[PDB]
Write a protein that binds this ligand. Sequence first.
Ligand SMILES: N#Cc1cccnc1N1CC[C@]2(c3ccc(F)cc3F)N=C(N)O[C@@H]2C1
Length: 374
Amino acid sequence: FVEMVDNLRGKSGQGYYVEMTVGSPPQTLNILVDTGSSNFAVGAAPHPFLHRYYQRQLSSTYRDLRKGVYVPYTQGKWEGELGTDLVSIPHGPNVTVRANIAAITESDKFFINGSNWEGILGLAYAEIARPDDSLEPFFDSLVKQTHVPNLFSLQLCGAEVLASVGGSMIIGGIDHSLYTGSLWYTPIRREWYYEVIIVRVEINGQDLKMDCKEYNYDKSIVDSGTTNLRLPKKVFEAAVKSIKAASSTEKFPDGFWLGEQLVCWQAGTTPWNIFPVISLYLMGEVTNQSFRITILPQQYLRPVDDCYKFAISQSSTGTVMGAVIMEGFYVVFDRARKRIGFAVSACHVHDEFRTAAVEGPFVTLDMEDCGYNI
Ligand SMILES: N#Cc1cccnc1N1CC[C@]2(c3ccc(F)cc3F)N=C(N)O[C@@H]2C1
């Protein structure tokens, strides 16, 4: 796994990408690692924010599928042409896969200015692929065509220009040098998104005391392709109220709490201690058990004087455990056993007083009733 360590790079708030090659001879592209989607899709035509793109005509191994695809998001969109080609990950497993590729020919508000990536690697399941679930996602193809074990793990490390970030994507195994302490597993509730169940939330040790259904309304997912911790309205409001109280020693504009305005202190004078830790308790493999991941202000205040943006925001599509949550931790996407594991990362954030943590078990009653019945 030594060759896969530190194979991720990115800019703060713009996602983590891995280097891939597509076609014969290999075309080098940087590809966003995205556990929140299921299409392998790459820019395939000129764009203002693209410094390179996939040129199908230069590839001897490209095969046209004679099928179009249109993919709208809430904020942006892209359309493209479906095909197959040979794909490799230079700092990944020593294998080559014939994968589905959506060649993006037109897009609106999709590509990010300065992000340094040219495509997206959807690592989630076929159920949410476009145009439909018959378009085998990349990881499925990799596992079927090669001997690579059905799992991958992500260590995202995070912290003029936006700060550069790094991490590792370990494909086909778990690298023990990348974490400390125990690995705790939460079940994948359904193979579509990487859906999980949160049973309890605490802010500075204080229970938010909501019906746990609220935490997973209408779902909760683990998503490397989203920056923030996104929370359902009711939970978000209770969360900020508590965070505001803990830090009321100082006062910030509404725009900060809205995740819009930045907030700065003199360099090195960031008062971390006035901000509370946040504990998310995830359902255990055992029915009435859970374990908690505890995250520090260092994670949910994202650097952009030292200037920070509040990286927790309101959602209407359920909880999203985005990059800022994942950054504390080594995260194992154990598809083979339908579970996601968390452990304290070798690159976790910590000051002399507090530290990110993964701790269990804690015993709770009725947590199957915490979900959303499809
Ligand atoms: N599936 C789905 C899905 C379903 C409904 C709404 N959104 C989805 N997401 C998939 C694309 C996405 C993304 C990534 C990068 C980027 F520049 C833009 C971008 F929209 N990736 C994630 N993880 O969330 C984003 C929206």
